[PDB]
RNA sequence: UUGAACAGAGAGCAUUUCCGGCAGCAGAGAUUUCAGCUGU
């Protein structure tokens, strides 16, 4: 019941800023007891969790954590991990865009000249290698290692497991950025057209075309928590999109100049964006407040990536530089480069690497291992980053050790429970709710009778009229705002009685001004008009 | 699955085991990962009784480490909370699962029963009675379960009526094994010896004889004979009279060698009338089983019956007051043998001579015994 | 520097021997499992669609049916698969509802067999072999109540005098009949309601409120000495046999065609009457129904409780039966067929899983209670899956996109059109009532549960 | 209700304890009639509690002839006395399921607290355990049941015909 | 992907991972398989041209049936495509909408003209032979298989001289004259 | 329908009756476990 890690398992609910029905009160006590019992027996599983995340801790003060070479790491770790830290070297086809699968099993490299390859990177099994002689840009897997989508010279192509072409997308005119929403089965695409396109991969149907209306799209990342896509344009504007709304759900002014790279935490809370104004920014995403602004980098951060344990890798040409606990709200977590005189409130880099001769293309963490695979101008290189991988995976979401029968069955299972595209909101706790209109107090038809009664008495009681008040500075008197917002040709009875009540309000303001200034006494209310009433 | 269910049935004891701070969290994780290995191997496919046994051995070792570490950390024998009974409850339940999954393994059944008896004051004899009940329903043929069951309820609990019920039900199931019969006679003479020695003790402070054992001897011989003749020449009795008579003598040899074993294991009950309770067996041997014990074959066993009868009161020490008082009895028996048989008279005289020369100042009486046997 | 990485060790996750399942190392983090509302929403939606494609409720008609329409049905309350039906040309039958074949068929009477029920007849001189004979008695409008024995194949204990062990006789016709669950007693309604026992050939007593005829009876099930009756002066009269006397009547707007008592609440009953709804009434306060089940379009002819006391089944004169939950007040499922005409007698089998319907084309049909539930025994994986789906449909029950699927059936043409014109007439009388409520002063609000009780003897304070 | 089951077979007598009742009113339905071919849905219904084997081929032949002409033998009496609980003779007897409607009276003559059921529900539970056989027994018997049935069928036939080898 | 069971096949009817609706039945793949088209966009670069001819024939049929602008331009387009070999006959004007087709423009390629002239055995071997540089039209060697060989210009498809294939057919009929190199 | 005596089952329901607190010691079972009495 005490459970030091319950706040990770808590679920937030509706607060309005208690009942008398006994049966409903019992139902609500049962609901609250069941919720607390399920949270406690859910959070009591960290005893059962098998592995533990890695670390590298300096054990000294002369040992800085970032001056540790990969040679020292590969000596100090075991042979399975130092054999996983691969190094492909493929010099003639161009800068290699690297993508992994969603589990750590497969790798998909995409040379800029023509060279695409889907492989098992920890076996030695390559299962597609194809030299599409035109300049390919990016590639992703779709829902398995079985299908992969490549963004070629203009058209996006979809190839199967052994490389045969399955589809040539006539839309997706010039993709440069591909992505996949795997619960929703949507291939997302942006590029040199200013359009964002979602292609439902199961049925085969373009779910949405969205005008970004900001020229070519410079960076694009997926928020894994709610599957909204963050794009990054040439204004230094990040924009959060959903396939339901033909506009961005949010528009953030992140940087000056363009935006080079976007990366999102897997808890959907933080976003690191680097722009070409040599600046990195860390954003809260659930509140859209800017946490950190690391400005004046030595050279513009061309790539950002965020692991499953909140590490933050930045690439600025040849350099790769990782910070640990830079996704926090304290200012003493802002990622710096040097602790001026050993200041322990400064976030010096976790580690670093200099890909000396070349310039890195893009980073991607291997999903469930302690590796950061970065693709560069001559091939691929995994980097053993010890603090940067979810060690305790869930095996009935996605499984590194899966078999062919488990792959077949999990494929049909997720295909069956494919979420629709319209359930992509800014938060996924919104699709059991009631409307944000349609009032909270449930109307038990006595109030519906009362609503018809006030609607039947809106005339001759003036319920749909602003009430008379002379003491509200009559240049903004509400009734004059009614008469001014209405169109000045038409006459209707509502504006007739608003006109009458405005003149009445002006008369009461006239007599209050007169008996404030003292030209007249208390009421003396027009003796002969009193007598001539009844006529 | 269900490995997840059992694996999270195991967490409140280690909530307790970290609260009472003897095991830290970092080693609760270690015993829990080994528990994960074992639980998956148990209730997946491809399982074995050795996986059950290795789980029980690991749970005993972590229990003993928990007791040792509770003594060493807290200087207290037991923390009188959940942590001390729950792992014994776990070991009992692993045993229960393994016995309900593989109920062909008497080794695992016996390890269950030995653990549940030797659990101590924590256990219940109704929790022993239920697992003896289901083991005995599963294996009605394996007689050593009934033997151990009655011996548990007598030589621990001493409930004589219920051990009588156990032996009567087991003899309803297999009236063919002589081991069950001989252990029933053993129980009953154990019972009457405890009965008459408590009679002697209560007499010293301040009806029921071996007749029950004689009746179970009677029905023991009758049923064992019926089952052996119905057993051999198995499928049918399609035979001639030569096979009938030869098989009837064959059952007689089997039955009477076993009643010899009854006597040689009957004699050691020296607090009651061993003479009378061997005299009833000698009297039952004296009658005929339609195979003519003294009129015909089993004539060497007729000599063995006469020899047992002659030594029945001559079961004596070297102190030969009784032998001097009743040597004329053996002399009259040897005279009756010399008056009737021809080669058996010679064999009985020679065997009585070697009997005196084996079971024989006092050497002058030994010359008198040699000149009495000469 | 200390360096630790992720070590997977490859034996804890992919097993050594080839004959066992792989592990499922597992992490209950919500960040691991992201879309927790949409994922179980689409599971609830797929569950509702799978319910709507697994709904196949018709099991089978039993036998070849009668010749002239089934007007009386009684299940026997101790044995699960035996059910006795009486036609309108006399021939009553005992049914084995597993093979769906008759044990025996008796030309019982010459007029209509107007009611029948079952018994364990406690004679004081004969012990009836209840494990081999089953007993049903039957009243008619040739003025007779006959009691029959049936040879029954349910045990093999023994190893034969079937028909008409005795013939009770009256002076007027008989309409309904129901038996006490103990003490060999039964009661018949007719021109007047009599109480009988199976020993004497004459009524023990006559328990008549007035000289108005009696159309239906039911005994109570627990608290086994309270009778209830429907008289054709729209009347519901309770009877108490501890005082051997009538108890209280209420008079309604239209005539009650059937009563059935609650097996699990002992004082609640449900009346099925001619205004096309069924009223769930309390015995200890008969001034208001405590539920109204409102979905038929013609005169409701019979009602039954499930033996769990949880839902009622209700067959009417539109050719359809309907299952209502007890706590709601509207339908839960309609069963119709083209070959089912004018369903007159509906019972809920004692399993609470099947529903027996007797129409007037001759036939007796078996329906499922839950039309999407099969009857096999279920392994633990699919039992957990199916009750998970039912809990998920329950909590998402009124999202619009799954409400409009779990609400939707194919109702036949006449019942549909009668429903929609009843809806427009109901909206017109609501609107005109609201207008006259706007004008006049003394317009009270009578509740829907009091809209139909034109009076009560022995008023309440 | 079908609480215990009696299956006689050439190795011995077995008493099963019924866990779940198969469906009575839908007993001819498709899923109910294929759950006795499925094993993962038959072990939900039937569970073994006792198996008393035979002494040999002599006792097996005598018991096969007694089970033929419907007489309760001593081994059958012993196993039913061990397994079936002491119910009433007048109010809710215990309930055994057999395959022979004229073995029924012979069992009720010895144990009058036992109702013997042989209708089609007990019949298809019986044919379920005859269909599965060695899997239900949890590995506890010695002897190949195929060789047992071969020897027993030859024994029964030679006895019934009075086959002479002389 | 796993040959869905019956409730799955009923619950997800539109799922198909290979054939989509925008593929138009894989006719790019199918006619480029028929005529052995090397690179992927040749079908669609021909499809733009078939679309332009069919658009123009549509707009040009929408004019009144008597006016000479309509009649003259339909005859000019019809003679143009017939002399380009894309059409087979200039008989009726509904050939401009029915029978102009990417497979027609592809049948007018050079390896297909080779195969229909019996200069190879199949379209793949014709593609191999003119990738290997044996085939000239007129005097000049042609090296890419995409070359479109009009009605006049298919009287000049020959092999080059000194080609081993010309040498071997002349020496098959033992008419090989080694004076003129082959 | 009730009661008696008898035979049970473990399958229910409690509780302030003791124990799961230590020494002295015998006895039983393979250096450890179990089986009762004199004061807490």
JSON list of N, CA and C in Angstrom, two decimals, chain A residues 42-92:
[
{"chain": "A", "resi": 42, "resn": "UNK", "atom": "N", "xyz": [-0.28, -3.60, -9.09]},
{"chain": "A", "resi": 42, "resn": "UNK", "atom": "CA", "xyz": [0.46, -3.34, -10.31]},
{"chain": "A", "resi": 42, "resn": "UNK", "atom": "C", "xyz": [1.87, -2.88, -10.02]},
{"chain": "A", "resi": 43, "resn": "UNK", "atom": "N", "xyz": [2.03, -1.96, -9.08]},
{"chain": "A", "resi": 43, "resn": "UNK", "atom": "CA", "xyz": [3.32, -1.42, -8.71]},
{"chain": "A", "resi": 43, "resn": "UNK", "atom": "C", "xyz": [4.13, -2.36, -7.85]},
{"chain": "A", "resi": 44, "resn": "UNK", "atom": "N", "xyz": [3.55, -3.46, -7.39]},
{"chain": "A", "resi": 44, "resn": "UNK", "atom": "CA", "xyz": [4.32, -4.45, -6.66]},
{"chain": "A", "resi": 44, "resn": "UNK", "atom": "C", "xyz": [5.00, -5.46, -7.55]},
{"chain": "A", "resi": 45, "resn": "UNK", "atom": "N", "xyz": [5.26, -5.13, -8.81]},
{"chain": "A", "resi": 45, "resn": "UNK", "atom": "CA", "xyz": [5.85, -6.06, -9.75]},
{"chain": "A", "resi": 45, "resn": "UNK", "atom": "C", "xyz": [7.33, -5.76, -9.99]},
{"chain": "A", "resi": 46, "resn": "UNK", "atom": "N", "xyz": [7.79, -4.61, -9.53]},
{"chain": "A", "resi": 46, "resn": "UNK", "atom": "CA", "xyz": [9.20, -4.27, -9.62]},
{"chain": "A", "resi": 46, "resn": "UNK", "atom": "C", "xyz": [10.09, -5.18, -8.77]},
{"chain": "A", "resi": 47, "resn": "UNK", "atom": "N", "xyz": [9.51, -6.02, -7.92]},
{"chain": "A", "resi": 47, "resn": "UNK", "atom": "CA", "xyz": [10.24, -7.15, -7.37]},
{"chain": "A", "resi": 47, "resn": "UNK", "atom": "C", "xyz": [10.44, -8.22, -8.41]},
{"chain": "A", "resi": 48, "resn": "UNK", "atom": "N", "xyz": [9.49, -8.38, -9.33]},
{"chain": "A", "resi": 48, "resn": "UNK", "atom": "CA", "xyz": [9.56, -9.44, -10.32]},
{"chain": "A", "resi": 48, "resn": "UNK", "atom": "C", "xyz": [10.37, -9.07, -11.54]},
{"chain": "A", "resi": 49, "resn": "UNK", "atom": "N", "xyz": [10.68, -7.80, -11.70]},
{"chain": "A", "resi": 49, "resn": "UNK", "atom": "CA", "xyz": [11.44, -7.33, -12.88]},
{"chain": "A", "resi": 49, "resn": "UNK", "atom": "C", "xyz": [12.82, -7.98, -12.98]},
{"chain": "A", "resi": 50, "resn": "UNK", "atom": "N", "xyz": [13.14, -8.67, -14.09]},
{"chain": "A", "resi": 50, "resn": "UNK", "atom": "CA", "xyz": [14.37, -9.47, -14.15]},
{"chain": "A", "resi": 50, "resn": "UNK", "atom": "C", "xyz": [15.69, -8.72, -14.21]},
{"chain": "A", "resi": 51, "resn": "UNK", "atom": "N", "xyz": [15.88, -7.81, -15.15]},
{"chain": "A", "resi": 51, "resn": "UNK", "atom": "CA", "xyz": [17.20, -7.23, -15.34]},
{"chain": "A", "resi": 51, "resn": "UNK", "atom": "C", "xyz": [17.31, -5.88, -14.65]},
{"chain": "A", "resi": 52, "resn": "UNK", "atom": "N", "xyz": [18.45, -5.24, -14.83]},
{"chain": "A", "resi": 52, "resn": "UNK", "atom": "CA", "xyz": [18.67, -3.90, -14.34]},
{"chain": "A", "resi": 52, "resn": "UNK", "atom": "C", "xyz": [19.44, -3.10, -15.37]},
{"chain": "A", "resi": 53, "resn": "UNK", "atom": "N", "xyz": [19.15, -1.81, -15.42]},
{"chain": "A", "resi": 53, "resn": "UNK", "atom": "CA", "xyz": [19.79, -0.92, -16.38]},
{"chain": "A", "resi": 53, "resn": "UNK", "atom": "C", "xyz": [21.25, -0.74, -16.03]},
{"chain": "A", "resi": 54, "resn": "UNK", "atom": "N", "xyz": [22.04, -0.43, -17.01]},
{"chain": "A", "resi": 54, "resn": "UNK", "atom": "CA", "xyz": [23.45, -0.25, -16.79]},
{"chain": "A", "resi": 54, "resn": "UNK", "atom": "C", "xyz": [23.78, 1.15, -16.39]},
{"chain": "A", "resi": 55, "resn": "UNK", "atom": "N", "xyz": [25.06, 1.37, -16.13]},
{"chain": "A", "resi": 55, "resn": "UNK", "atom": "CA", "xyz": [25.55, 2.67, -15.69]},
{"chain": "A", "resi": 55, "resn": "UNK", "atom": "C", "xyz": [27.01, 2.76, -16.06]},
{"chain": "A", "resi": 56, "resn": "UNK", "atom": "N", "xyz": [27.53, 3.98, -16.05]},
{"chain": "A", "resi": 56, "resn": "UNK", "atom": "CA", "xyz": [28.96, 4.13, -15.81]},
{"chain": "A", "resi": 56, "resn": "UNK", "atom": "C", "xyz": [29.16, 5.31, -14.88]},
{"chain": "A", "resi": 57, "resn": "UNK", "atom": "N", "xyz": [29.76, 5.03, -13.73]},
{"chain": "A", "resi": 57, "resn": "UNK", "atom": "CA", "xyz": [29.91, 5.93, -12.61]},
{"chain": "A", "resi": 57, "resn": "UNK", "atom": "C", "xyz": [31.39, 6.12, -12.32]},
{"chain": "A", "resi": 58, "resn": "UNK", "atom": "N", "xyz": [31.83, 7.34, -12.13]},
{"chain": "A", "resi": 58, "resn": "UNK", "atom": "CA", "xyz": [33.26, 7.66, -12.26]},
{"chain": "A", "resi": 58, "resn": "UNK", "atom": "C", "xyz": [34.18, 7.15, -11.17]},
{"chain": "A", "resi": 59, "resn": "UNK", "atom": "N", "xyz": [33.64, 6.82, -10.00]},
{"chain": "A", "resi": 59, "resn": "UNK", "atom": "CA", "xyz": [34.31, 6.27, -8.81]},
{"chain": "A", "resi": 59, "resn": "UNK", "atom": "C", "xyz": [35.51, 7.09, -8.31]},
{"chain": "A", "resi": 60, "resn": "UNK", "atom": "N", "xyz": [35.59, 8.37, -8.66]},
{"chain": "A", "resi": 60, "resn": "UNK", "atom": "CA", "xyz": [36.79, 9.16, -8.44]},
{"chain": "A", "resi": 60, "resn": "UNK", "atom": "C", "xyz": [36.39, 10.62, -8.54]},
{"chain": "A", "resi": 61, "resn": "UNK", "atom": "N", "xyz": [37.39, 11.48, -8.73]},
{"chain": "A", "resi": 61, "resn": "UNK", "atom": "CA", "xyz": [37.10, 12.80, -9.24]},
{"chain": "A", "resi": 61, "resn": "UNK", "atom": "C", "xyz": [37.95, 13.17, -10.43]},
{"chain": "A", "resi": 62, "resn": "UNK", "atom": "N", "xyz": [39.02, 12.42, -10.68]},
{"chain": "A", "resi": 62, "resn": "UNK", "atom": "CA", "xyz": [39.83, 12.66, -11.86]},
{"chain": "A", "resi": 62, "resn": "UNK", "atom": "C", "xyz": [39.28, 11.94, -13.07]},
{"chain": "A", "resi": 63, "resn": "UNK", "atom": "N", "xyz": [38.36, 11.01, -12.85]},
{"chain": "A", "resi": 63, "resn": "UNK", "atom": "CA", "xyz": [37.78, 10.22, -13.92]},
{"chain": "A", "resi": 63, "resn": "UNK", "atom": "C", "xyz": [36.54, 10.96, -14.39]},
{"chain": "A", "resi": 64, "resn": "UNK", "atom": "N", "xyz": [36.66, 11.67, -15.50]},
{"chain": "A", "resi": 64, "resn": "UNK", "atom": "CA", "xyz": [35.45, 12.25, -16.04]},
{"chain": "A", "resi": 64, "resn": "UNK", "atom": "C", "xyz": [34.72, 11.21, -16.85]},
{"chain": "A", "resi": 65, "resn": "UNK", "atom": "N", "xyz": [33.40, 11.27, -16.79]},
{"chain": "A", "resi": 65, "resn": "UNK", "atom": "CA", "xyz": [32.56, 10.28, -17.42]},
{"chain": "A", "resi": 65, "resn": "UNK", "atom": "C", "xyz": [32.56, 10.34, -18.94]},
{"chain": "A", "resi": 66, "resn": "UNK", "atom": "N", "xyz": [32.98, 11.45, -19.53]},
{"chain": "A", "resi": 66, "resn": "UNK", "atom": "CA", "xyz": [32.87, 11.62, -20.97]},
{"chain": "A", "resi": 66, "resn": "UNK", "atom": "C", "xyz": [34.16, 11.33, -21.70]},
{"chain": "A", "resi": 67, "resn": "UNK", "atom": "N", "xyz": [35.29, 11.24, -21.01]},
{"chain": "A", "resi": 67, "resn": "UNK", "atom": "CA", "xyz": [36.55, 10.94, -21.66]},
{"chain": "A", "resi": 67, "resn": "UNK", "atom": "C", "xyz": [36.85, 9.45, -21.66]},
{"chain": "A", "resi": 68, "resn": "UNK", "atom": "N", "xyz": [35.81, 8.63, -21.72]},
{"chain": "A", "resi": 68, "resn": "UNK", "atom": "CA", "xyz": [35.93, 7.19, -21.78]},
{"chain": "A", "resi": 68, "resn": "UNK", "atom": "C", "xyz": [35.72, 6.75, -23.21]},
{"chain": "A", "resi": 69, "resn": "UNK", "atom": "N", "xyz": [36.76, 6.19, -23.80]},
{"chain": "A", "resi": 69, "resn": "UNK", "atom": "CA", "xyz": [36.72, 5.76, -25.18]},
{"chain": "A", "resi": 69, "resn": "UNK", "atom": "C", "xyz": [35.90, 4.50, -25.34]},
{"chain": "A", "resi": 70, "resn": "UNK", "atom": "N", "xyz": [35.46, 4.27, -26.57]},
{"chain": "A", "resi": 70, "resn": "UNK", "atom": "CA", "xyz": [34.78, 3.02, -26.88]},
{"chain": "A", "resi": 70, "resn": "UNK", "atom": "C", "xyz": [35.73, 1.84, -26.83]},
{"chain": "A", "resi": 71, "resn": "UNK", "atom": "N", "xyz": [37.03, 2.07, -26.98]},
{"chain": "A", "resi": 71, "resn": "UNK", "atom": "CA", "xyz": [38.00, 1.00, -26.78]},
{"chain": "A", "resi": 71, "resn": "UNK", "atom": "C", "xyz": [38.02, 0.53, -25.33]},
{"chain": "A", "resi": 72, "resn": "UNK", "atom": "N", "xyz": [37.99, 1.48, -24.40]},
{"chain": "A", "resi": 72, "resn": "UNK", "atom": "CA", "xyz": [37.91, 1.16, -22.98]},
{"chain": "A", "resi": 72, "resn": "UNK", "atom": "C", "xyz": [36.59, 0.48, -22.63]},
{"chain": "A", "resi": 73, "resn": "UNK", "atom": "N", "xyz": [35.48, 0.92, -23.25]},
{"chain": "A", "resi": 73, "resn": "UNK", "atom": "CA", "xyz": [34.20, 0.25, -23.02]},
{"chain": "A", "resi": 73, "resn": "UNK", "atom": "C", "xyz": [34.23, -1.18, -23.54]},
{"chain": "A", "resi": 74, "resn": "UNK", "atom": "N", "xyz": [34.71, -1.37, -24.77]},
{"chain": "A", "resi": 74, "resn": "UNK", "atom": "CA", "xyz": [34.71, -2.69, -25.37]},
{"chain": "A", "resi": 74, "resn": "UNK", "atom": "C", "xyz": [35.69, -3.62, -24.70]},
{"chain": "A", "resi": 75, "resn": "UNK", "atom": "N", "xyz": [36.67, -3.08, -23.99]},
{"chain": "A", "resi": 75, "resn": "UNK", "atom": "CA", "xyz": [37.47, -3.94, -23.14]},
{"chain": "A", "resi": 75, "resn": "UNK", "atom": "C", "xyz": [36.73, -4.29, -21.85]},
{"chain": "A", "resi": 76, "resn": "UNK", "atom": "N", "xyz": [36.00, -3.33, -21.28]},
{"chain": "A", "resi": 76, "resn": "UNK", "atom": "CA", "xyz": [35.43, -3.55, -19.95]},
{"chain": "A", "resi": 76, "resn": "UNK", "atom": "C", "xyz": [34.11, -4.30, -19.96]},
{"chain": "A", "resi": 77, "resn": "UNK", "atom": "N", "xyz": [33.47, -4.47, -21.10]},
{"chain": "A", "resi": 77, "resn": "UNK", "atom": "CA", "xyz": [32.20, -5.19, -21.15]},
{"chain": "A", "resi": 77, "resn": "UNK", "atom": "C", "xyz": [32.43, -6.59, -21.68]},
{"chain": "A", "resi": 78, "resn": "UNK", "atom": "N", "xyz": [31.39, -7.39, -21.63]},
{"chain": "A", "resi": 78, "resn": "UNK", "atom": "CA", "xyz": [31.43, -8.78, -22.02]},
{"chain": "A", "resi": 78, "resn": "UNK", "atom": "C", "xyz": [31.39, -8.95, -23.53]},
{"chain": "A", "resi": 79, "resn": "UNK", "atom": "N", "xyz": [31.53, -10.20, -23.97]},
{"chain": "A", "resi": 79, "resn": "UNK", "atom": "CA", "xyz": [31.81, -10.44, -25.37]},
{"chain": "A", "resi": 79, "resn": "UNK", "atom": "C", "xyz": [30.56, -10.39, -26.21]},
{"chain": "A", "resi": 80, "resn": "UNK", "atom": "N", "xyz": [29.38, -10.62, -25.62]},
{"chain": "A", "resi": 80, "resn": "UNK", "atom": "CA", "xyz": [28.16, -10.48, -26.39]},
{"chain": "A", "resi": 80, "resn": "UNK", "atom": "C", "xyz": [27.91, -9.02, -26.72]},
{"chain": "A", "resi": 81, "resn": "UNK", "atom": "N", "xyz": [28.14, -8.13, -25.76]},
{"chain": "A", "resi": 81, "resn": "UNK", "atom": "CA", "xyz": [27.91, -6.71, -26.02]},
{"chain": "A", "resi": 81, "resn": "UNK", "atom": "C", "xyz": [28.98, -6.13, -26.92]},
{"chain": "A", "resi": 82, "resn": "UNK", "atom": "N", "xyz": [30.23, -6.54, -26.75]},
{"chain": "A", "resi": 82, "resn": "UNK", "atom": "CA", "xyz": [31.26, -6.03, -27.63]},
{"chain": "A", "resi": 82, "resn": "UNK", "atom": "C", "xyz": [31.20, -6.66, -29.01]},
{"chain": "A", "resi": 83, "resn": "UNK", "atom": "N", "xyz": [30.45, -7.74, -29.18]},
{"chain": "A", "resi": 83, "resn": "UNK", "atom": "CA", "xyz": [30.16, -8.23, -30.51]},
{"chain": "A", "resi": 83, "resn": "UNK", "atom": "C", "xyz": [28.90, -7.61, -31.10]},
{"chain": "A", "resi": 84, "resn": "UNK", "atom": "N", "xyz": [28.04, -7.06, -30.25]},
{"chain": "A", "resi": 84, "resn": "UNK", "atom": "CA", "xyz": [26.89, -6.34, -30.76]},
{"chain": "A", "resi": 84, "resn": "UNK", "atom": "C", "xyz": [27.28, -4.96, -31.25]},
{"chain": "A", "resi": 85, "resn": "UNK", "atom": "N", "xyz": [28.33, -4.38, -30.69]},
{"chain": "A", "resi": 85, "resn": "UNK", "atom": "CA", "xyz": [28.77, -3.06, -31.15]},
{"chain": "A", "resi": 85, "resn": "UNK", "atom": "C", "xyz": [29.42, -3.18, -32.51]},
{"chain": "A", "resi": 86, "resn": "UNK", "atom": "N", "xyz": [28.60, -3.24, -33.55]},
{"chain": "A", "resi": 86, "resn": "UNK", "atom": "CA", "xyz": [29.13, -3.55, -34.86]},
{"chain": "A", "resi": 86, "resn": "UNK", "atom": "C", "xyz": [29.73, -2.31, -35.51]},
{"chain": "A", "resi": 87, "resn": "UNK", "atom": "N", "xyz": [30.32, -2.53, -36.68]},
{"chain": "A", "resi": 87, "resn": "UNK", "atom": "CA", "xyz": [30.93, -1.47, -37.46]},
{"chain": "A", "resi": 87, "resn": "UNK", "atom": "C", "xyz": [30.91, -1.92, -38.91]},
{"chain": "A", "resi": 88, "resn": "UNK", "atom": "N", "xyz": [29.88, -1.54, -39.65]},
{"chain": "A", "resi": 88, "resn": "UNK", "atom": "CA", "xyz": [29.85, -1.76, -41.07]},
{"chain": "A", "resi": 88, "resn": "UNK", "atom": "C", "xyz": [30.59, -0.61, -41.72]},
{"chain": "A", "resi": 89, "resn": "UNK", "atom": "N", "xyz": [31.17, -0.85, -42.88]},
{"chain": "A", "resi": 89, "resn": "UNK", "atom": "CA", "xyz": [32.01, 0.15, -43.55]},
{"chain": "A", "resi": 89, "resn": "UNK", "atom": "C", "xyz": [31.79, 0.03, -45.05]},
{"chain": "A", "resi": 90, "resn": "UNK", "atom": "N", "xyz": [30.89, 0.85, -45.57]},
{"chain": "A", "resi": 90, "resn": "UNK", "atom": "CA", "xyz": [30.32, 0.68, -46.91]},
{"chain": "A", "resi": 90, "resn": "UNK", "atom": "C", "xyz": [30.53, 1.98, -47.69]},
{"chain": "A", "resi": 91, "resn": "UNK", "atom": "N", "xyz": [31.69, 2.15, -48.30]},
{"chain": "A", "resi": 91, "resn": "UNK", "atom": "CA", "xyz": [32.16, 3.50, -48.55]},
{"chain": "A", "resi": 91, "resn": "UNK", "atom": "C", "xyz": [31.61, 4.16, -49.79]},
{"chain": "A", "resi": 92, "resn": "UNK", "atom": "N", "xyz": [31.07, 3.43, -50.76]},
{"chain": "A", "resi": 92, "resn": "UNK", "atom": "CA", "xyz": [30.81, 4.05, -52.05]},
{"chain": "A", "resi": 92, "resn": "UNK", "atom": "C", "xyz": [29.41, 4.63, -52.20]}
]
